[PDB]
Design an enzyme around this catalytic site. Structure first.
Site, PDB file in Angstrom:
ATOM      1  NE  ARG A  52      -1.886  -2.384   3.580  1.00 46.90           N
ATOM      2  CZ  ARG A  52      -2.323  -2.884   4.748  1.00 46.90           C
ATOM      3  NH1 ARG A  52      -3.528  -2.587   5.225  1.00 46.90           N
ATOM      4  NH2 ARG A  52      -1.535  -3.690   5.453  1.00 46.90           N
ATOM      5  CG  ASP A  54       3.832   6.295   1.445  1.00 50.11           C
ATOM      6  OD1 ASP A  54       4.315   5.232   0.968  1.00 50.11           O
ATOM      7  OD2 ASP A  54       4.137   6.710   2.600  1.00 50.11           O
ATOM      8  NE  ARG A 199       7.347  10.178   1.919  1.00 53.84           N
ATOM      9  CZ  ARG A 199       6.152  10.388   2.455  1.00 53.84           C
ATOM     10  NH1 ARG A 199       5.368   9.357   2.739  1.00 53.84           N
ATOM     11  NH2 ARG A 199       5.747  11.629   2.721  1.00 53.84           N
TER      12      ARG A 199
END
Lengths: 264, 264
Positions: A52, A54, A199
């Site tokens: 999933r 972002d 990230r």
RNA sequence: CCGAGGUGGUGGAAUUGGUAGACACGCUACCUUGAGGUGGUAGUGCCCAAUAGGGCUUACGGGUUCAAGUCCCGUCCUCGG
RNA sequence: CGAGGUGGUGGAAUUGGUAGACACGCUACCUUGAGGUGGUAGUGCCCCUUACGGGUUCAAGUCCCGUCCUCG
């Protein structure tokens, strides 16, 4: 009525999307993918992600599986579906599989790549495909520094405030930092990931190559087990889910990951 | 009031534009570039191209020069400028120059690169940045075949139909065809070009690598001096003006050409 | 008394003039959802009558410049011993 | 030893993939070289559409039926 479970190699460009998870008010790859995947199987299809991703997070090795009674030829899932897919989201291959398979639960490990543009001036081409970074970077320091995240660790310091999993523990397989032209690529892999881990790794990892922090700083943050200490999370605007892993028994097609020209 | 003549390395993405050529009621890089170049110098600026790029034709080594009285430091032309520029069009550098310089005429030779995606399925990432091609290509045949266009020749057969004068002759410096991953890159260079010259070479050049034509076919068409005999043109959707040449005396900055990761 | 410093509701930024508040937390209503959190959308400032598209906002009024939280002139302040 | 009917023409469309790409003409609105060439936009319905009706499929220029033709 016999059912069929097949896998698809979805490759997309979140440039103009609000993530993968369907919504109601906005655009989501899934929504589309399903919208069209079903328009083929002629029966409301629902697909299962394998990572999933972002919002604004490109993918090229995304994998998904869905069940269906519809017995298509084979070119369908391919061209067929892409046929009803917006230029930014397309299929790469398809392979039937056993119930024991599950694009998300059968995964053994996932891998991402981050593309950083290290130049004082903004870039045009692939504008929404790469992250901009004026301050000069040091591919060697970054790589070096980023070598302690290897192995089972408590990425707490690197995990997002909120999450979903229970533990801040993960096993990082490999994490190499390279530099092609004024571009700096971060390649990483691990059994699974914690919310915004990548990230964040980069985020801070950027600081080191910019000499705004020492090299040890990385392992320091890690060991510190505390999110509020490390550089801010980075712009998803360059995170590419380049590849996922599955048991050889299922046997899934392995094409290039790039993205683009970048070799495997 | 002293005037200044400076050069700029414009890099853009014709994805969402109607070509370089300034137009009315439509979007055109120029229009924008000027629109913003002037905002800075604060006096209606008009620029000069160095290679009129057709519609949907990306550029990264585009060079332009404009005159101006405005004495801006050099942060303007580099940053200030881009600031007022849409993400798809940005500057790469700037260097003052002598009147004797002229981005279009001072040019000694221009160079392009063509990116072909050779896969039976459509691509997502960089969708409007590369040409999609199903049937399999042969980088070797293509390269081979495409080795007779080297040198001064009468590219009539390869020139866009309309013409009467200013010769169908051109001197091709180098033309190599390579393949990076499922990607096939066509790199070419010549003193100057004839209308569509590239988009045609490839066009046909594609046929050879697809065994839809023999290898000699190329040289045949050329020698045949006739447009209608060579495979149709090639989608502008992947033509990148990667680089232009100028006399060392003027001395202009030479950054990467790519596009993207592609090495020089 | 000379020098530090004043950015949303917070923590916390801004390529060293480029063109705001990145990252995060905290709340208002809203969506999915069944109300498991997570995930998304708008706010969380001020105007332009609402509509709308937008505009002004970096303690407050002036100045410099193509462009200013970022250079300068002062006004109220908030401290350091 | 041959077989067809896509816009003003030619002339292409993956494996039945989701239409006219490419090139000529034609009308616009621009448009520097300085010998004058180029850009882009338009060129099938009306306030769905590949001779025209059918049939099969999630999918039809693309396979099957028909109907009127073009042809050796």
């Amino acid at each position: 009525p016999p059912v069929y479970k097949i896998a698809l190699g979805i490759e997309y460009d979140g440039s103009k999307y609000y993530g993968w998870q369907r919504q109601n008010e906005v655009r989501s790859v899934q929504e589309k993918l399903e919208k069209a995947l079903s328009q083929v199987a002629n029966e409301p299809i629902t697909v299962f992600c394998a990572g999933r991703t972002d919002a604004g997070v490109h993918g090229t090795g995304q994998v998904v599986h869905f069940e269906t009674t519809a017995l298509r030829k084979d070119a369908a899932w391919t061209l067929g579906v892409n046929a009803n897919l917006p230029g930014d989201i397309a299929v790469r291959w398809v392979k039937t599989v056993p119930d024991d398979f599950h694009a998300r639960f059968s995964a053994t490990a996932r891998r991402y790549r981050y593309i950083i543009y290290n130049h004082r001036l903004r870039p045009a081409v692939l504008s929404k495909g790469v992250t901009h970074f004026y301050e000069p970077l040091d591919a060697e320091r970054m790589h070096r520094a980023a070598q302690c995240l290897l192995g089972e660790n408590d990425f707490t310091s690197f995990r997002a405030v909120q999450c979903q999993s229970r533990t801040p523990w993960r096993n990082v397989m490999h994490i190499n930092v390279t530099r092609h032209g004024p571009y700096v690529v971060v390649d990483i892999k691990a059994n699974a990931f914690v919310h915004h881990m990548v990230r964040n790794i980069v985020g801070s990892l950027m600081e080191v190559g910019a000499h705004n922090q020492p090299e040890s700083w990385i392992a320091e943050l890690l060991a510190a087990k505390d999110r509020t200490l490390a550089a801010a999370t980075a712009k998803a605007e360059g995170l590419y889910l380049v590849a996922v892993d599955y048991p050889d028994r299922y046997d899934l097609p392995k094409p290039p990951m790039g993205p683009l020209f970048l070799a495997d």
